[PDB]
């Protein structure tokens, strides 16, 4: 696929300014509503907004952002849940201390359904007493920690609750985020420094009381710094094409989606498959060179080839864990690996007519 056929689709991908403006505004405009009502209760006193983005994470719809809500526990002590490396019991070391979310302690553990009843309960009523915007609350999905709403029936608004822990990261964690030979070990330990945070995730019946560890800033941060060098997109001469890379494969990924909606062999596939995908690529190929825009398309099909594997293969690490497989067959079952595996080929075979439209 020509390198220039890439970049059209991109090109064509594009939102002018004041789609970003308009949304951006309708959003902001309901978030500092739900953001400053939540404070207005001892335990969401100390809420805040952390920057996943701000904008969209689906390139095609751009009606639909993601906002995360941080908010500091002091102290924690983690317990690792049978033995599944990204699921997490929250409890408190002072104990005979009086907690702000004490109404949501379980007994010693911190009960992420009540914290997640509560917010969503407040979220509703707050978006029912709301008269300058028409805003809808949109019903439960199976087993998500977000709060979707609706903005004048186009803007998809998901909110994520989280819990934010200062404390050094945990030791599921410590061989991950292999970016030494990348952005080099100082990036890494300076990185690492940064707090980690908690969401309301249960793990597989279900164990509806347990946090999965989320590094979603950390993402971002080396998302927007991405480069082996420090001027890396800054000049003319440093422009890569890793960014480019990644939007590609998340719209073949979302056009793969949508075009087989009826069947529900793709529902388990997502974005972050591809994120993290991509960030194993980057681990890979360290090298700016590497990444030369000229060689865009050989550089996209290293990141389908190597995603393919990773269905072929059944494995998929997270970047932060490495003890945890997203593409593990209890997680998705091999049919629809399979599925995805076959249809990729095809559309890598065909010169990809899902970016033609
Ligand atoms: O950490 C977060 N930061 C911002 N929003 C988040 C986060 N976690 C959940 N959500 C919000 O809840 C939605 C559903 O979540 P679900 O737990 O059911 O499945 C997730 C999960 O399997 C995987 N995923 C996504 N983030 C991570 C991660 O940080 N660490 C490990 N896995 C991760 O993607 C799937 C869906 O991706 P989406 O983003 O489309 O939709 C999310 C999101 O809206
Ligand atoms: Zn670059």
């Known amino acids: ?99 702000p979310l004490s109404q949501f302690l379980e007994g010693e553990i911190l009960s992420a359904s009540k914290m997640l009843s509560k917010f969503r309960k407040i979220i509703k009523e707050e978006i029912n007493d709301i008269k300058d915007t028409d805003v809808i609350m949109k019903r439960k999905r199976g087993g998500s920690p977000a709060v979707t709403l609706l903005i004048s029936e186009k803007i998809s608004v998901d909110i994520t609750l989280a819990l934010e822990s200062k404390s050094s990261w945990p030791a599921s964690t410590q061989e991950g985020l292999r970016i030494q030979n990348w952005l080099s070990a100082k990036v890494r330990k300076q990185l690492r420094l940064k707090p980690f945070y908690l969401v309301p995730k249960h793990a597989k019946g279900f164990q509806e009381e347990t946090w999965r560890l989320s590094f979603s800033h950390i993402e971002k941060e080396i998302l927007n710094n991405h480069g082996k060098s420090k001027t890396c997109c800054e000049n003319k ?40 995908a991509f960030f194993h690529v980057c681990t890979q190929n360290p090298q700016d060179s590497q990444w030369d825009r000229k060689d865009l398309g050989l550089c996209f099909d290293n990141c389908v080839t190597y995603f393919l594997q990773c269905l072929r293969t059944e494995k998929l690490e997270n970047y932060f864990i490495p003890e945890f497989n997203l593409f593990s067959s209890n997680l998705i079952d091999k049919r629809s690996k399979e599925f995805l595996t076959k249809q990729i080929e095809y559309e890598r075979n065909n010169e990809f007519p899902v970016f033609d439209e």
């Open 1 to 99: 696929m020509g390198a220039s056929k890439l970049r059209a689709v991109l090109e064509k991908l594009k939102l002018s300014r004041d789609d970003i403006s308009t949304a951006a505004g309708m959003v902001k405009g309901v978030v500092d509503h739900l953001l400053l009502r939540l404070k207005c209760d001892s335990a969401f006193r100390g809420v805040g907004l952390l920057n996943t983005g701000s904008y969209y994470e689906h390139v095609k719809a751009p009606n639909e952002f993601d906002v995360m809500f941080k908010l500091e526990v002091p102290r924690i002590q983690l317990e690792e849940y049978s033995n599944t490396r990204a699921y997490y019991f929250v409890k408190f070391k002072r104990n005979p201390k009086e907690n």
């Open 237 to 276: 001469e440093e422009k890569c094409c890793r960014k480019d890379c990644l939007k590609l494969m998340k719209y073949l990924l979302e056009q793969l989606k949508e075009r087989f909606k009826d069947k529900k062999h793709l529902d388990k596939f997502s974005s972050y498959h591809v994120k993290t």
